[PDB]
Amino acid sequence: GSSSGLPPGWEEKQDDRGRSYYVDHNSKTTTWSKPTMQD
């Protein structure tokens, strides 16, 4: 807990092609998705 932005266990970083992707450490899988906002 420290503000909010990335889900628990998500790394935001660029791939070989140089695009910012996200990887979920929960299942351990790279998934290029844009995190939704629930407010």
């Binding site: 791939d15 070989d16 899988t29 998934t31």
Partner: peptide
Amino acid sequence: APLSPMSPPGYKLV
């Protein structure tokens, strides 16, 4: 399949 299909490279390489 409990794991999501990876589209961009980097993780696990390929």
